[PDB]
Amino acid sequence: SKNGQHNEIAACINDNLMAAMMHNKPHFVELYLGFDAKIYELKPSEEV
Amino acid sequence: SVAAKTLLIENEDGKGSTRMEVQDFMKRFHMHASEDDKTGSPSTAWGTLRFPTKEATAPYLRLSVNDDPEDALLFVKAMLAQKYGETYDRPSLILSVTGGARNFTLPPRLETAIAKGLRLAAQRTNAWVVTGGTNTGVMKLTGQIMEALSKTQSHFIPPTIGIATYGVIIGGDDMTRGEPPKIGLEYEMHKKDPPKTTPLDDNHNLFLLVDDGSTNKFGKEIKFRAAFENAAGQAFAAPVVTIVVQGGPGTLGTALQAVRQGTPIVVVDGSGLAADVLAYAYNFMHNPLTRFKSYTIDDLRQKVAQTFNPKSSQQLTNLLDSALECVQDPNLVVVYSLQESGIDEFDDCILKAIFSSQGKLGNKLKQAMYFDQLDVAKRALSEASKNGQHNEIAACINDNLMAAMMHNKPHFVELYLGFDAKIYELKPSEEV
Amino acid sequence: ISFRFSLDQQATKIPINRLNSAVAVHGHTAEAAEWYVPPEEYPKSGGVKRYLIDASMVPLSIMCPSYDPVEYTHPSVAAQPVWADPADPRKIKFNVKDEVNGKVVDRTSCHPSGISIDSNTGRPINPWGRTGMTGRGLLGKWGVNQAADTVVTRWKRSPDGSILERDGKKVLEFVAIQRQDNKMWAIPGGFVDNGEDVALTSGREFMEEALGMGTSADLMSAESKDSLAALFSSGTIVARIYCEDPRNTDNAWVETTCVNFHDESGRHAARLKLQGGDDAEHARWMMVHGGLNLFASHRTLLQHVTSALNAYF
Amino acid sequence: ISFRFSLDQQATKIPINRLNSAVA
Amino acid sequence: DLMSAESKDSLAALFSSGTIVARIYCEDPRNTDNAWVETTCVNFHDES
Ligand SMILES: Nc1ncnc2c1ncn2[C@@H]1O[C@H](COP(=O)(O)OP(=O)(O)OC[C@H]2O[C@@H](O)[C@H](O)[C@@H]2O)[C@@H](O)[C@H]1O
Ligand SMILES: Nc1ncnc2c1ncn2[C@@H]1O[C@H](COP(=O)(O)O)[C@@H](O)[C@H]1O
Ligand SMILES: O=P(O)(O)OC[C@H]1O[C@@H](O)[C@H](O)[C@@H]1O
Numbered sequence: 001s002k003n004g005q006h007n008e009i010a011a012c013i014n015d016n017l018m019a020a021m022m023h024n025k026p027h028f029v030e031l032y033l034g035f036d037a038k039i040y041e042l043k044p045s046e047e048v
Numbered sequence: 049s050v051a052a053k054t055l056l057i058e059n060e061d062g063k064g065s066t067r068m069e070v071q072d073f074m075k076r077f078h079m080h081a082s083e084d085d086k087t088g089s090p091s092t093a094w095g096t097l098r099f100p101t102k103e104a105t106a107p108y109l110r111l112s113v114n115d116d117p118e119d120a121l122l123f124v125k126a127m128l129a130q131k132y133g134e135t136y137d138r139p140s141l142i143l144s145v146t147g148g149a150r151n152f153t154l155p156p157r158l159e160t161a162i163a164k165g166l167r168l169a170a171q172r173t174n175a176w177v178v179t180g181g182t183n184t185g186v187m188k189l190t191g192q193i194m195e196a197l198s199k200t201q202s203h204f205i206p207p208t209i210g211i212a213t214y215g216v217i218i219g220g221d222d223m224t225r226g227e228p229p230k231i232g233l234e235y236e237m238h239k240k241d242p243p244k245t246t247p248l249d250d251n252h253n254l255f256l257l258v259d260d261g262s263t264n265k266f267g268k269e270i271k272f273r274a275a276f277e278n279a280a281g282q283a284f285a286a287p288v289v290t291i292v293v294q295g296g297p298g299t300l301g302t303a304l305q306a307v308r309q310g311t312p313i314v315v316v317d318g319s320g321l322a323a324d325v326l327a328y329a330y331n332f333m334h335n336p337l338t339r340f341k342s343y344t345i346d347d348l349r350q351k352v353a354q355t356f357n358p359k360s361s362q363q364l365t366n367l368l369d370s371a372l373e374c375v376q377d378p379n380l381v382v383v384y385s386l387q388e389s390g391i392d393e394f395d396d397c398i399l400k401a402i403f404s405s406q407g408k409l410g411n412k413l414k415q416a417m418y419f420d421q422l423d424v425a426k427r428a429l430s431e432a433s434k435n436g437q438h439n440e441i442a443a444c445i446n447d448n449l450m451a452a453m454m455h456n457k458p459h460f461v462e463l464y465l466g467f468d469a470k471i472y473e474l475k476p477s478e479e480v
Numbered sequence: 481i482s483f484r485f486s487l488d489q490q491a492t493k494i495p496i497n498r499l500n501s502a503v504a505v506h507g508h509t510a511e512a513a514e515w516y517v518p519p520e521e522y523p524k525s526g527g528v529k530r531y532l533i534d535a536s537m538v539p540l541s542i543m544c545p546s547y548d549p550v551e552y553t554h555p556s557v558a559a560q561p562v563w564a565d566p567a568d569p570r571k572i573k574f575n576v577k578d579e580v581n582g583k584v585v586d587r588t589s590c591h592p593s594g595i596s597i598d599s600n601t602g603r604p605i606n607p608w609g610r611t612g613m614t615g616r617g618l619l620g621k622w623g624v625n626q627a628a629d630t631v632v633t634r635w636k637r638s639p640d641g642s643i644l645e646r647d648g649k650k651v652l653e654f655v656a657i658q659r660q661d662n663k664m665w666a667i668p669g670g671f672v673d674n675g676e677d678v679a680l681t682s683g684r685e686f687m688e689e690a691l692g693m694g695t696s697a698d699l700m701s702a703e704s705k706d707s708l709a710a711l712f713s714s715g716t717i718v719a720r721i722y723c724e725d726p727r728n729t730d731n732a733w734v735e736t737t738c739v740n741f742h743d744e745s746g747r748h749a750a751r752l753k754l755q756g757g758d759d760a761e762h763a764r765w766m767m768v769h770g771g772l773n774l775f776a777s778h779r780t781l782l783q784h785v786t787s788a789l790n791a792y793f
Numbered sequence: 794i795s796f797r798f799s800l801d802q803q804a805t806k807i808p809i810n811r812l813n814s815a816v817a
Numbered sequence: 818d819l820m821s822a823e824s825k826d827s828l829a830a831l832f833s834s835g836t837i838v839a840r841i842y843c844e845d846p847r848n849t850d851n852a853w854v855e856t857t858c859v860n861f862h863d864e865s
């Protein structure tokens with residue numbers, strides 16, 4: 001956040017929030033949601 | 049509604065208000081047909097604007113750069129006095145929000161934190177927030193904050209004065225031509241004017257369009273904005289606090305004018321751009337803490353060059369010199385950190401800026417009472433007690449105790465009563 | 481962390497065996513003769529313009545046959561006050577102490593070559609280069625106008641009392657005045673009067689400009705006077721240089737002697753009530769650094785003060 | 794505060810090139 | 818690439834204070850009887 005780095009943060013925040021939900025870590029879910037991760041722009045790993 | 053024909057302007061003596069015709073008062077405002085013109089012509093651009101999805105209309109006045117800011121202050125006072133009666137709620141704080149308008153991109157958490165601090169300060173002090181008049185960046189964000197503030201209020205609504213340079217406004221051509229009293233003129237933010245591209249913010253309650261005979265040039269309203277806030281500050285005996293978030297070269301000029309006119313500034317560090325430059329400069333020149341011993345003029349010059357893009361050595365020298373001139377007086381600059389210090393200390397920075405001024409001691413005690421900081425009031429009283437100062441303390445203790453009772457602060461009531469305030473020598477503000 | 485840094489810099493603190501490898505970086509633009517050229521419009525002259533010359537054509541060793549300077553003398557100087565020399569410079573002796581009305585005037589330049597006298601008119605020629613303008617201009621004395629500058633310094637201290645430290649050196653702080661004529665910040669000082677020395681001139685100008693005590697404010701309490709006398713008893717002449725003053729001409733130029741009054745403890749400096757008077761508008765304590773924008777060659781003077789005191793610049 | 798003052802005065806502790814301006 | 822030109826002033830400042838510490842004979846494996854390497858050593862010390 002201090003080092004700007006907006007491109008690298010936005011590309012990986014969604015998958016990390018998703019991973020936090022799968023491994024049952026709610027504190028990490030609230031933390032990742034606080035760091036500008038839009039809830040409806042979450043993407044699945046495989047293709048349907 | 050029926051158009052006003054006469055208006056009540058408060059006298060220069062400060063003892064009552066006299067009623068006179070609007071065209072007689074309004075003759076003192078000028079406009080420039082071209083840049084070359086100096087003497088000018090009668091303004092003819094004043095009235096009210098109606099915005100979509102907004103119930104109330106916002107007054108606008110186009111005035112010239114050479115016009116007296118006291119006259120514009122009289123105009124704002126005369127409209128509020130007309131709408132809410134003579135005994136309207138006077139401001140005890142003028143909060144000027146300046147900064148980035150186009151390239152104002154920020155992370156959401158920083159906005160919300162500044163917004164929370166700004167909203168609390170504004171709601172507790174009934175502050176007049178003066179930003180620019182346009183629908184961009186931090187001013188638009190501040191407009192949204194005061195829009196939410198405007199709903200919970202019942203009678204008195206604090207003005208959100210927008211001071212913008214005329215000549216950049218897409219609805220500027222429609223408003224000037226015509227019958228001078230324009231009651232409720234519709235403002236079209238989506239209409240396509242070819243040369244100008246910057247629209248007005250729909251959440252601002254009043255507009256001052258500063259004119260200098262130019263088109264599509266910015267930063268012409270900076271000197272008048274600092275002078276108008278200073279004039280307003282002297283008139284209502286209230287401290288003026290400027291807040292700097294991000295910003296370009298004109299924000300640097302705004303801070304420079306503000307520090308030259310005696311107005312304290314609060315620079316939000318960690319928001320990037322000009323604020324980081326100002327914070328770096330202040331920390332280099334004044335802060336004795338250890339992290340800032342490696343700070344240098346060369347790295348500061350590198351920061352100015354990387355942020356502002358001066359394209360020449362002389363321009364870089366003038367900006368760097370102006371940035372160093374802003375933080376020359378350590379009292380007039382207060383640096384807030386949104387990434388190092390705590391979340392609830394922004395109001396402490398605003399109060400420190402209020403406390404850093406010279407006069408208005410009763411108002412400073414009142415301001416300390418509004419933010420619920422007894423320790424600050426206790427330290428100021430203790431310093432006054434040590435420094436003798438019996439004449440200034442005895443003249444203002446009664447009104448402060450009275451004010452503490454009106455705003456429901458019992459701890460402040462006990463504190464003021466402990467500092468030699470006789471209960472039966474309390475006096476009312478008006479005369480029966 | 482403060483003591484660790486202070487003890488650490490107290491340890492590894494530090495023309496023969498010295499090598500400059502900057503030529504590998506710059507190339508043919510290593511050093512250039514970056515001399516002083518005054519601005520085109522002479523100050524307070526009503527729009528009178530000089531004869532423009534490039535900075536690479538200025539020194540007197542170089543011939544320069546295309547030289548047509550303008551002769552200008554200010555009306556204030558031409559009205560003949562007490563501090564102004566006569567318009568005909570004959571019978572005046574330069575490079576030695578000359579007596580005008582029984583009063584001693586210095587007239588000696590710090591240039592190693594000295595002042596050369598023109599045979600045709602008897603007027604002096606400036607050894608520090610060409611300036612595109614003859615005559616006296618705003619300066620009252622032919623040749624060297626002796627100026628005395630007073631740099632009253634103290635260490636820049638925090639409320640806890642510790643001295644502020646930048647780039648491993650202690651930070652200075654000097655009294656700076658805003659000039660009445662051109663509104664640029666500067667070191668207090670002024671021209672040396674007839675019959676007076678640098679000591680009296682330095683003290684008198686600092687009292688008149690920075691403190692405003694020159695028959696216009698009030699009388700000082702007389703216990704405070706002993707402190708000011710104690711401050712002024714220890715001064716070191718740090719430099720005697722040529723000023724880059726925009727009022728300089730070919731027949732009258734300002735040369736300064738700089739006197740530094742340093743307050744090691746900071747007690748005497750803190751008792752000064754700064755208030756701009758005489759030909760100064762405002763006076764304030766100002767931090768000394770290399771990015772300062774001051775009038776004439778006062779940055780060079782501050783560089784000399786920090787060089788002598790081993791301070792930050 | 795005592796060591797800071799002591800180390801600070803241990804640092805900037807200090808007839809030719811000497812001028813007396815007390816006559817002014 | 819070309820250096821930013823503010824960074825260049827810093828590198829020039831670093832290179833302006835160098836002390837020749839030694840001028841010795843190299844123990845270089847390419848040395849022969851008719852050609853040998855002898856070095857002059859220049860030290861650029863950064864105190865800060
Ligand atoms: N008040 C404005 N409103 C809209 N756009 C603006 C404004 N000022 C400048 N711009 C445009 O934004 C571009 C650069 O944006 P910024 O760097 O955000 O401009 P900045 O210098 O920050 O704005 C200065 C202005 O902002 C106000 O807070 C303050 O009153 C000051 O006048 C400029 O080229 C200009 O076209
Ligand atoms: N040698 C001098 N040259 C030019 N001006 C002088 C001189 N001596 C005295 N003055 C006057 O002193 C004013 C400012 O000098 P001072 O007050 O000494 O700083 C000038 O504007 C002149 O009126
Ligand atoms: O009379 P004023 O202009 O105030 O004093 C002369 C100044 O002009 C500068 O070159 C001198 O160093 C000196 O400070």
Ligand SMILES: [Mg+2]
Nearest residue numbers: 670685758759
């Ligand atoms: Mg003087």
Ligand SMILES: [Mg+2]
Nearest residue numbers: 669670689759
């Ligand atoms: Mg002077």
Ligand SMILES: [Mg+2]
Nearest residue numbers: 670671673685
């Ligand atoms: Mg004088």
